[PDB]
Ligand binder design. Structure first.
Ligand SMILES: Cc1cn([C@H]2C[C@H](O)[C@@H](COP(=O)(O)OP(=O)(O)OP(=O)(O)O)O2)c(=O)[nH]c1=O
Ligand SMILES: [Ca+2]
Ligand SMILES: [Ca+2]
Ligand SMILES: [Ca+2]
Ligand SMILES: [Ca+2]
Ligand SMILES: [Ca+2]
Length: 326
DNA sequence: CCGACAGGCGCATCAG
DNA sequence: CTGATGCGCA
DNA sequence: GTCGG
């Protein structure tokens, strides 16, 4: 809230570039700016003051100038009244409709929740589930409920095979008091970078979670990654809990820390960490950290036995999950 | 100035 | 059918 | 939209 007006403003423009301009690099640029301003511990008095931050430049500065003086932004007022823009922006709030489909729907006269709800035959499976649980997917998950979802998931995973480890990552592991969804990192000794000795390792976990009515829906599902919906059981004469987005990723056990670094986030922390490693001659994915030879070719994986080790290689002081939030 | 800008899984489509 | 490209999302 | 080489 310190520069809340400013970071709200920038985030809105970020969402505009992504969903309407389909300009993914302007999106990121505005998000980087937002991020850096949020962490800045003085009430910003001018654009010039903000320009001294990395990722804030000439044009965001002018925008901050206009906002400080008048309390709003002309470019945004216009965007707020452009019907098309607002309609394309709204439809992307549905899980499974990105900038492209949203623009296609709006060209065909589909602009509202009602339009969607009586054109189910035009949506793919994912888009349909997102529509179905549209309101639920935008409620946040209190940490108390995340703690119950974690208990179910670990216990059921345990029940399929005691050798599995499941770790709830995302904002939950960063200690947040509320979460947007649930991210589960799954490992098992039969799946490593060198061999897959059992098949259905992810499937059997999903199947067990569906069997106890915890996973209610499936958005997509391959061998290593599941994306879907889950729900806590409710007691008698109570309202049902909202349905919730759940992601489960099966990662090679020997690449656990690159993996858990990756799903712990935040999204911008990773982007800033991958972007900083690139500048120091490495590349990081969910799997490995590798060096970069002059040609742009990735060297062979470096040894890693902790989250901390990854931070060393790119000359960063270890930051606890709590301190990786935006 | 002007080239990247993080990286990859699953689903969907298109050319052959 | 592969293989390549784009989308939506993590 | 921003940066740094
Ligand atoms: C979406 C996204 C996720 N990630 C990583 C980091 C995230 O912690 C993880 C998935 O987390 P998410 O499920 O996106 O949740 P979150 O960490 O954003 O927190 P919230 O629930 O409050 O929205 O994957 C990226 O590196 N880049 C991205 O763009
Ligand atoms: Ca700057
Ligand atoms: Ca969406
Ligand atoms: Ca999450
Ligand atoms: Ca997620
Ligand atoms: Ca029900």
């Amino acid at each position: 809230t310190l520069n809340g007006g400013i970071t709200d403003m920038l985030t809105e423009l970020a969402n505009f570039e992504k969903n309407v301009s389909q300009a993914i690099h302007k999106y990121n640029a505005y998000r980087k700016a937002a991020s850096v301003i949020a962490k800045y511990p003085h009430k910003i008095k001018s654009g010039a003051e903000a320009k001294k931050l990395p990722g804030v430049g000439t044009k965001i500065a002018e925008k901050i100038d206009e906002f400080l003086a008048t309390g709003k932004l002309r470019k945004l007022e216009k965007i707020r009244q452009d019907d098309t823009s607002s309609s394309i922006n709204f439809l992307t709030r549905v899980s499974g409709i990105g900038p492209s489909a949203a623009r296609k729907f709006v060209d065909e006269g589909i602009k509202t929740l009602e339009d969607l709800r009586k054109n189910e035959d035009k949506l793919n499976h994912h888009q349909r589930i997102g529509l179905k649980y549209f309101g639920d997917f935008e409620k946040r998950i209190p940490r108390e409920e995340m703690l119950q979802m974690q208990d179910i998931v670990l216990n059921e995973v345990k029940k399929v095979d005691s050798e599995y480890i499941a770790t709830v990552c995302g904002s939950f592991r960063r200690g947040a008091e509320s979460s947007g969804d649930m991210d589960v990192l799954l490992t098992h000794p039969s799946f490593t970078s060198e061999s897959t000795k059992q098949p259905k390792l992810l499937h059997q976990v999903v199947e067990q979670l569906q069997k106890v009515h915890f996973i209610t829906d499936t958005l997509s599902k391959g061998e290593t990654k599941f994306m879907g919906v889950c729900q806590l059981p409710s007691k008698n004469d109570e309202k049902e809990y909202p349905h919730r987005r759940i992601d489960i990723r099966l990662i090679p056990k020997d690449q656990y820390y690159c993996g858990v670094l990756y799903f712990t986030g935040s999204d911008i922390f990773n982007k800033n960490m991958r972007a900083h490693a690139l500048e120091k001659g490495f590349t990081i994915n969910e799997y490995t950290i590798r060096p970069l030879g002059v040609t742009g070719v990735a060297g062979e994986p470096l040894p890693v036995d902790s989250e901390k080790d990854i931070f060393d290689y790119i000359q960063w002081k270890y930051r606890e999950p709590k301190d990786r939030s935006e």
